[PDB]
Amino acid sequence: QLTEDQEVVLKQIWTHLFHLWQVPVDGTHIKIHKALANLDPQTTKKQFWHDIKNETPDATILKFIRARKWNADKTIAMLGHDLYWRKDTINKIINGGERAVYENNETGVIKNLELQKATIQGYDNDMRPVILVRPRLHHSSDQTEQELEKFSLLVIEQSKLFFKENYPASTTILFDLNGFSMSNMDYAPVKFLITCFEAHYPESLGHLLIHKAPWIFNPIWNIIKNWLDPVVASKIVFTKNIDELHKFIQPQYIPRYLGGENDNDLDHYTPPDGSLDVHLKDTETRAMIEKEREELVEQFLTVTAQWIEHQPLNDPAYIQLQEKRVQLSTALCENYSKLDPYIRSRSVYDYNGSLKV
Ligand SMILES: CCCCCCCC/C=C\CCCCCCCC(=O)O[C@H](COC(=O)CCCCCCCCCCCCCCCCC)COP(=O)(O)O[C@@H]1[C@H](O)[C@H](O)[C@@H](O)[C@H](O)[C@H]1O
């Protein structure tokens, strides 16, 4: 749970947002802010709530509030910038999946998926989804920079689809540098993705694992972290053996080829043939659910405005309001789970049975 100062900052952000979406609210009790100031009310509203899929809205927002140390203004800055860069693109990327990438015969997205350069391989001790990246299979000639940005966003939004409630909504990355030579190195997309990520997927990384990777390419890190942001630095962990991989991942998900019991096909990819995508046709059912969901969103906005105003904090009605907001959030999560088969092409992880939403 949050404390009273924390709820203060969360209220400040939600207020800014309703002021963008023109829903009524009285912030004072505790006109448009400049970071948001070039965003369109109807559009940004619709997009932000399409982007709220299996996490609660408060969580979606508190991630940005934490990534800026609870400073209201830089938080609204970072967040409005996220909205202006995400819009309805990421939605489209993940709902079209691999299927509309194959369909649109986008060459680089297809090589990257086929390479299994980046893939989802299971869970760590904290039930976070884990992404195997093995750069020994990257070449800058395979894909264009923007196609690589798209493959990355897709892999990560697939990792987000796994998010266990009551467990971290972050993703662990296993970087197998085993096999890495200077043929494979492409700095431009790396920087671009890291900027992409820190500004747009804040508080989304659990651990950055560097496994059985060079034996002296660990030392220099160990005091550089004092000059790095302590949070991300503590997230990065260098391991060099399956015994150090047991500290983080359970043996059933570590691949065999590193000493695990996960026997997945790592060299042959079985792309979605579209056969669980049968509910992409039910336009009537999808709208049935989407109207129920808009009912939900309006309830949430009204209750959230009430919350932003109502005084005091010890008032019974206030605990009533908190309850309802949690009720609503959960209703919206259950609802997305109903909606999913009607908006989202089944992904490779839908077919093998690793992903249930
Ligand atoms: C050679 C090319 C390889 C092709 C290989 C390309 C294929 C890979 C495609 C996708 C891979 C997976 C996506 C990665 C998402 C990682 C999550 C993430 O966003 O990481 C961010 C941190 O940066 C990173 O994790 C590094 C990015 C990892 C993977 C993306 C690029 C991969 C390129 C790797 C280089 C080569 C391999 C070596 C391994 C090094 C790993 C970088 C956010 O940190 P976080 O603590 O979670 O929140 C921040 C917040 O956000 C900040 O603002 C705040 O200031 C701060 O206080 C915190 O709150």
Swiss-Prot record:
GO MF term set: phosphatidylinositol transfer activity
CRAL-TRIO domain location: 106-266
GO terms (BP aspect): Golgi to plasma membrane protein transport; Golgi to plasma membrane transport; negative regulation of fatty acid biosynthetic process; negative regulation of phosphatidylglycerol biosynthetic process; phosphatidylinositol metabolic process; phospholipid catabolic process; phospholipid transport; positive regulation of phosphatidylcholine biosynthetic process
CDD domains listed in its UniProt record: SEC14
PROSITE patterns from the UniProt entry: CRAL_TRIO
Reactions listed under catalytic activity: a 1,2-diacyl-sn-glycero-3-phospho-(1D-myo-inositol)(in) = a 1,2-diacyl-sn-glycero-3-phospho-(1D-myo-inositol)(out)
Places the protein is found: Cytoplasm; Microsome; Endosome
UniProt keywords, alphabetically: Acetylation, Cytoplasm, Endoplasmic reticulum, Endosome, Lipid degradation, Lipid metabolism, Lipid transport, Microsome, Phospholipid degradation, Phospholipid metabolism, Phosphoprotein, Transport
Primary location class: cytoplasm
Tree of life domain: Eukaryota
InterPro entries with a match to the protein in the record: CRAL-TRIO_dom, CRAL-TRIO_dom_sf, CRAL/TRIO_N_dom, CRAL/TRIO_N_dom_sf, PITP/CRAL-TRIO
GO cellular component, one term: endosome
UniProt-listed Gene3D superfamilies: CRAL-TRIO lipid binding domain (3.40.525.10)
One Pfam family matching this protein: CRAL_TRIO
PANTHER family cross-referenced by the UniProt entry: PHOSPHATIDYLINOSITOL TRANSFER PROTEIN CSR1 (PTHR46590:SF1), PHOSPHATIDYLINOSITOL TRANSFER PROTEIN CSR1-RELATED (PTHR46590)
Role played: Non-classical phosphatidylinositol (PtdIns) transfer protein (PITP), which exhibits PtdIns-binding/transfer activity in the absence of detectable PtdCho-binding/transfer activity. Activates SPO14/PLD1 (phospholipase D1) by stimulating phosphoinositide synthesis via the STT4 PtdIns 4-kinase. Modulates ArfGAP function through effects on SPO14 activity. Inhibits phosphatidylcholine degradation by PLB1 (phospholipase B1). May also regulate post-Golgi membrane-trafficking events and have a role resistance to oxidative stress.
Family assignment from sequence similarity: Belongs to the PITP family.
Note: Present with 9600 molecules/cell in log phase SD medium.
Subunit relationships: Forms a complex with 2 TSA2 subunits. Binds phosphatidylinositol (PtdIns).
Protein name in the entry: Phosphatidylinositol transfer protein CSR1
Annotated organism of origin: Saccharomyces cerevisiae (strain ATCC 204508 / S288c) (Baker's yeast)
